[PDB]
Coordinates of C-alpha atoms and ligand atoms in Angstrom, one line a residue:
Chain A
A213 CA 0.0 0.0 0.0
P214 CA 1.5 3.4 -0.8
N215 CA 2.8 5.7 1.9
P216 CA -0.1 7.7 3.3
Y217 CA -0.1 11.3 2.3
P218 CA 1.7 13.5 4.8
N219 CA -0.5 14.5 7.7
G220 CA 0.9 16.5 10.6
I221 CA -2.1 15.6 12.9
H222 CA -1.1 13.2 15.6
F223 CA -1.8 12.5 19.3
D224 CA 0.9 11.9 21.9
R225 CA 0.7 9.4 24.7
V226 CA 3.8 9.7 26.9
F227 CA 5.8 12.7 25.7
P228 CA 5.5 15.3 22.8
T229 CA 7.2 13.7 19.8
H230 CA 7.0 16.7 17.5
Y231 CA 6.0 14.5 14.6
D232 CA 7.0 15.8 11.2
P233 CA 5.6 13.8 8.3
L234 CA 8.2 15.4 6.0
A235 CA 11.2 14.3 8.0
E236 CA 11.1 10.7 6.9
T237 CA 10.3 8.9 3.7
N238 CA 8.2 6.0 5.1
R239 CA 5.9 6.7 8.0
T240 CA 7.2 4.9 11.1
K241 CA 4.7 2.6 12.7
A242 CA 2.6 3.9 15.6
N243 CA 3.6 2.5 19.0
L244 CA 1.0 2.4 21.8
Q245 CA 3.1 4.6 24.2
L246 CA 4.5 7.0 21.6
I247 CA 1.9 8.3 19.1
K248 CA -1.5 7.8 17.4
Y249 CA -1.9 9.2 13.9
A250 CA -4.9 10.9 12.4
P251 CA -7.6 8.7 11.0
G252 CA -7.9 7.8 7.3
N253 CA -4.5 6.7 6.2
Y254 CA -5.9 6.7 2.7
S255 CA -8.7 9.3 2.7
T256 CA -9.6 12.5 0.8
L257 CA -11.9 15.4 1.5
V258 CA -15.3 15.3 -0.2
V259 CA -18.7 17.0 0.3
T260 CA -21.7 14.7 1.0
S261 CA -25.3 15.1 1.8
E262 CA -27.9 13.2 3.7
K263 CA -30.9 11.8 1.9
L264 CA -34.2 13.3 3.0
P265 CA -36.8 10.7 4.2
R266 CA -38.9 9.2 1.5
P267 CA -42.3 10.5 2.8
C268 CA -40.7 14.0 3.1
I269 CA -39.7 13.7 -0.6
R270 CA -43.1 12.6 -1.7
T271 CA -44.7 15.7 -0.2
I272 CA -42.1 17.9 -1.9
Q273 CA -42.9 16.3 -5.3
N274 CA -46.6 16.7 -4.7
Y275 CA -46.2 20.4 -3.9
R276 CA -44.1 21.0 -7.0
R277 CA -46.5 19.2 -9.2
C278 CA -49.5 21.0 -7.7
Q279 CA -47.6 24.2 -8.1
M280 CA -46.7 23.9 -11.8
Chain B
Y152 CA 67.0 25.8 37.5
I153 CA 68.2 28.6 39.8
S154 CA 65.4 30.8 38.4
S155 CA 62.4 30.9 40.7
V156 CA 60.3 32.3 37.9
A157 CA 61.3 29.4 35.7
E158 CA 60.5 26.9 38.4
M159 CA 57.3 28.8 39.2
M160 CA 55.9 27.7 35.8
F161 CA 56.8 24.1 36.3
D162 CA 55.3 24.1 39.8
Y163 CA 52.1 25.6 38.4
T164 CA 51.9 22.6 36.0
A165 CA 52.6 20.0 38.7
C166 CA 49.8 21.5 40.8
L167 CA 47.5 21.5 37.8
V168 CA 48.3 17.9 36.8
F169 CA 47.7 17.1 40.5
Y170 CA 44.1 18.2 40.1
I171 CA 43.6 16.9 36.5
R172 CA 44.4 13.3 37.7
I173 CA 41.2 13.6 39.8
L174 CA 38.9 15.9 37.8
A175 CA 39.4 14.2 34.5
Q176 CA 38.0 11.0 35.9
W177 CA 34.5 12.5 35.9
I178 CA 34.4 12.0 32.2
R179 CA 34.0 8.3 33.1
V180 CA 30.8 9.2 35.1
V181 CA 29.6 11.1 32.0
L182 CA 30.2 8.0 29.9
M183 CA 28.2 5.9 32.3
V184 CA 25.3 8.3 32.3
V185 CA 25.2 8.7 28.5
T186 CA 25.4 4.9 28.0
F187 CA 22.6 4.4 30.6
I188 CA 20.4 7.1 28.9
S189 CA 20.8 5.5 25.5
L190 CA 19.6 2.2 26.8
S191 CA 16.6 3.8 28.5
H192 CA 15.8 5.6 25.3
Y193 CA 15.8 2.3 23.3
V194 CA 13.6 0.5 25.8
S195 CA 11.1 3.3 26.3
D196 CA 10.7 3.6 22.5
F197 CA 10.6 -0.1 21.8
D198 CA 7.8 -1.3 19.6
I199 CA 4.5 -2.4 21.3
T200 CA 1.2 -2.4 19.3
Ligands
LIG142 C1 17.6 -17.0 19.5 C2 17.5 -16.3 18.1 C3 17.9 -14.9 18.1 C4 17.0 -14.0 19.1 C5 15.6 -13.8 18.5 C6 14.5 -14.4 19.4 C7 13.3 -13.4 19.4 C8 12.3 -14.0 18.5 C9 11.0 -13.2 18.5 C10 9.8 -14.2 18.5 C11 8.6 -13.6 17.8 C12 7.5 -14.7 17.5 C13 6.1 -14.3 17.7 C14 5.9 -12.8 17.8 C15 4.4 -12.4 17.4 C16 3.9 -11.4 18.4 C17 4.4 -10.0 18.1 C18 3.6 -9.5 16.9 O1 2.7 -10.1 16.4 O2 4.1 -8.3 16.3 C19 3.7 -7.2 17.0 C20 4.6 -6.0 16.7 C21 4.8 -5.9 15.2 O3 3.6 -6.0 14.6 P1 3.3 -4.9 13.4 O4 4.5 -4.2 13.0 O5 2.2 -4.0 13.8 O6 2.8 -5.7 12.0 C22 1.4 -5.9 11.8 C23 1.2 -6.3 10.3 N1 -0.2 -6.2 10.0 O7 5.8 -6.3 17.4 C24 5.9 -5.9 18.7 O8 5.1 -5.2 19.2 C25 7.0 -6.4 19.6 C26 6.5 -7.5 20.5 C27 6.2 -7.0 21.9 C28 7.5 -6.6 22.6 C29 7.4 -7.0 24.1 C30 8.8 -6.8 24.7 C31 9.1 -8.0 25.6 C32 10.3 -7.7 26.4 C33 11.3 -8.9 26.2 C34 12.5 -8.8 27.2 C35 12.5 -10.0 28.1 C36 12.9 -9.5 29.5 C37 13.5 -10.7 30.3 C38 13.4 -10.4 31.8

């Protein structure tokens, strides 16, 4: 799997490690007492939307149809 | 030498050497501390997942 894209977000456990994702080529593995990395090793930023309930959609369609 | 000023310099070295024989041994204590810290650093950062 490719090296995850550099992400400076991390969470310390014992001491501040000052993690720099650009200081090493391959990201070192996360030890339990040292660091926890940000979620989504392989993730991008998108925009999403919830789907309105089906009965709420049927009333919107009925209003538009009755309107036109 | 008959020169007290000439011997004064050699006596200043003998007294300095007299203290260096003792003070320079604290580098051994520095070596013991540094070697002990490097082991603690390896164990504290050892892998556990
Ligand atoms: C005699 C030959 C030369 C000496 C070598 C002998 C040592 C051999 C080691 C035997 C290992 C065999 C089974 C190990 C499996 C359990 C560990 C493991 O699963 O790995 C966990 C992990 C690596 O896994 P990942 O990198 O995340 O890979 C995941 C891939 N998806 O490794 C570890 O966490 C290290 C294991 C825990 C270390 C515990 C330290 C124990 C201290 C031992 C000192 C003894 C003190 C004596 C008093």
